[PDB]
């Protein structure tokens, strides 16, 4: 080159705008075949041969290697949808890539993009205001029916699709079992406080819900008992090993006769602590730290159960559920050490079971509060991992519905209505912005097209029928009931989705529109690029 010696490659004009659109478009095409109940799955084989099967949109993109900056923006777009909501991570990627592609043709025609950007923002703001007319009140619907159907709808297009009724009952029961009562009047449903365990073996229809808690640990020693019919659980956070002076303290001996008493105290301080614990009636001991082999003997003779190397987060939930209190030391508000009986947990049973060649621990019927855990069974490990990711999507959907009592129809009824509304509303602007708004309405129409294409049907006839039905709902307000016509993919016909039981939380459609528009605007504001060579 001549001027601007930068030691790098720069591109300007139509060169970088077209290149950015293709980079964004290619990301959508990878995951376009994973949307809808007729969707399929993918493998992702790394170099070392580890296999992974999933259709979860966020998981796929996180596992790919991308270096084009216009595409990396979309990869974290799906990641953000996971944290904020947890569902619809594939719908957002498709929408964002369609907004860019449709806006690019507007810019090739001599339209200044700042006019286009303002057109997009107005469309997004008006769409969210309109979406508060298609609201369905949760309490108006049956409490159990709305939760069950919402879980079933978000469980379709997965490995456990037709097993919905079995799994939807498990999912709702687990969520209602962790309901928390909080400040003034706010309830709380902290999902991911339910422990999910995987173990291959029998079929998935024999996966069982546990009314209590489950630990992936085994008892410390063989001689110790392996079932307690009335547990007095004590939770501890410190190791039980032979004591040892701190690093600052040294031991110097000038009278040999004192050596014998010195060495006893190392093993005798720990003995006294154990007897304080066992004198109050504790049967089960749980510890995050380790336990020396000598300390296990005292539990054996007293007939008590003890476990070492317990995860912190597990101990927090058991202490909350069983009423016990986590201790990092024994000292009290005075000098000496005490261990009262008002600080013990209580559970109805502790059993170590056998599940396909290994063992784990079950705690049943905790009395302070209720807690639940789920064990999943499958043909092998790859299949077991798939239900786990496919169950986390079900837990999040139910939690969002309970917190916010409002759902919207699925199948594409939302996009079909919005496309009709925006096209009619843009005719009252009377400036170059109507062009941008009209492009927004057409871009939303990609979702119903993608669903019908994957089912090997006529995506032109079906979508044309919807636009006729939703039009007759906007005008002629006697037929206003026709704003719930959705889409059926098995028979390729329209059907009333509200009565059919297809529901999605509103916070999915609402948040997806906002996030997609922001990612489309930031990419649209780039006209040139500068890349510096590696040093």
């Amino acid at each position: 080159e001549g001027p601007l010696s930068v030691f790098g490659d720069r591109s300007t004009g139509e060169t970088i705008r077209s290149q950015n659109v293709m980079a964004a478009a290619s990301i959508a095409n990878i995951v376009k075949s994973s949307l809808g109940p007729v969707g399929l799955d993918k493998m992702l084989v790394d170099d070392i041969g580890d296999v992974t099967i999933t259709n979860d949109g966020a998981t796929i993109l996180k596992l790919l290697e991308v270096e084009h900056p216009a595409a990396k923006v979309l990869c974290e777009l799906a990641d953000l949808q996971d944290k904020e909501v947890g569902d619809g991570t594939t719908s957002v990627v498709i929408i964002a890539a369609e907004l860019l592609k449709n806006a690019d043709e507007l810019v090739k025609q001599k339209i200044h993009p700042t006019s286009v950007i303002s057109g997009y923002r107005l469309a997004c703001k008006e769409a969210v205001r309109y979406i508060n007319e298609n609201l369905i009140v949760n309490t108006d619907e049956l409490g159990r029916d709305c939760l069950i159907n919402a879980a079933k709808t978000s469980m379709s297009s997965k490995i456990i699709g037709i097993n919905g009724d079995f799994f939807a009952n498990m999912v709702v029961d687990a969520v209602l079992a962790i309901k928390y009562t909080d400040i003034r009047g706010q309830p709380r449903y902290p999902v991911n406080s339910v422990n999910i365990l995987k173990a291959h073996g029998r079929s998935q229809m024999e996966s069982m819900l546990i009314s209590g808690y489950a630990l992936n640990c085994v008892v410390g020693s063989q001689g110790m008992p392996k079932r307690i019919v009335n547990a007095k659980i004590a939770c501890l956070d410190f190791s039980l090993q032979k004591t040892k002076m701190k690093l600052g303290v040294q031991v110097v001996i000038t009278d040999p006769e004192k050596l014998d008493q010195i060495r006893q105290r190392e093993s005798d301080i720990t003995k006294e602590r154990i007897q304080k614990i066992l004198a109050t009636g504790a049967n089960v001991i749980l510890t995050t730290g380790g336990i020396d082999d000598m300390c296990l003997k005292y539990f054996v003779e007293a007939g008590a159960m003890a476990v070492r190397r317990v995860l912190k987060r597990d101990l927090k939930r058991i202490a909350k559920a069983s009423g016990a209190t986590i201790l990092s030391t024994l000292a009290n508000l005075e000098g000496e050490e005490t261990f009262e009986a008002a600080m013990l947990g209580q559970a109805e049973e502790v059993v170590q079971e056998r599940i396909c060649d290994d063992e784990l621990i079950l705690i049943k019927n905790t009395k302070a509060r209720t807690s639940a855990s789920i064990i999943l069974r499958g043909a092998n490990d790859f299949m077991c991992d798939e239900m786990e990711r496919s169950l986390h999507d079900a837990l999040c959907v139910v939690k969002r519905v309970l917190e916010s009592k409002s759902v919207v129809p699925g199948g594409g009824a939302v996009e079909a209505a919005l496309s009709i509304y925006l096209e009619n509303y843009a005719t009252s602007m009377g400036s170059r912005e109507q062009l941008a708004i009209a492009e927004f309405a057409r871009s939303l129409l990609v979702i119903p097209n993608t669903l019908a294409v994957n089912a090997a049907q006529d995506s032109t006839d079906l979508v044309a029928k919807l636009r006729a039905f939703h039009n007759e709902a906007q005008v002629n307000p006697e037929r206003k009931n026709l704003k719930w016509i959705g889409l059926d993919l098995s028979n390729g016909k329209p059907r009333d989705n509200k009565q059919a039981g297809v529901f999605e939380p509103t916070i999915v459609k609402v948040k997806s529109l906002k996030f997609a528009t922001e990612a489309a605007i930031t990419i649209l504001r780039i006209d040139d690029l500068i890349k510096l060579h590696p040093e």
Binding site: V73, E76, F515, E518, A519, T522
Partner: protein, 154 residues
């Protein structure tokens, strides 16, 4: 006082941060020099128009140099009229015409697409921005003209 900035990407957040940091600096300048001036390229067209009339007063070799300095100020008002998709020659000719027969607030109006009174559009900027920009520019150019040779050292 503290401000919390949100966003959807790390790229958007940093650009949102820098934009806020300028809005803060504009207010700071408004306290150091309690003066306001019209924007939209008005300070530059008016600068060029009066310098042209000033050059005719001078005689000799100096008159040419001030004329070159006068015409250099036309770059900015043309640049704004170019990025908006207008005809740069037509706009600047209209601007210099309207500044030489009266009003001085006339400037480019992107919303309307032509030239109109600027203060009716509520676009202003502090005086220190225009003065400091000009002063630092001329000091650098006078420094560049003193250079004569380039050599390579260790």
């Amino acid at each position: 006082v503290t401000i919390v900035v949100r966003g959807s990407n790390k790229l958007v957040i940093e650009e949102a941060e820098r934009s806020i940091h300028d809005a803060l600096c504009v207010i700071r300048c408004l306290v150091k020099k309690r003066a306001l001036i019209a924007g939209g390229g008005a300070p530059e067209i008016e600068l060029a128009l009066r310098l042209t009339e000033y050059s005719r007063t001078l005689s000799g070799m100096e008159s040419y140099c001030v004329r070159a300095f006068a015409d250099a100020m036309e770059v900015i008002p043309s640049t704004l009229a170019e990025n908006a998709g207008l005809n740069p020659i037509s706009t600047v000719t209209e601007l210099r015409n309207r500044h030489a027969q009266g009003e001085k607030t006339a400037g480019i109006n992107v919303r309307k697409g032509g030239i109109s009174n600027i203060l009716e559009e509520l676009v202003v900027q502090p005086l220190l921005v225009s003065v400091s920009a000009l002063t630092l520019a001329t000091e650098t150019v006078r420094s560049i003209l003193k250079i004569d040779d380039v050599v390579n050292t260790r």
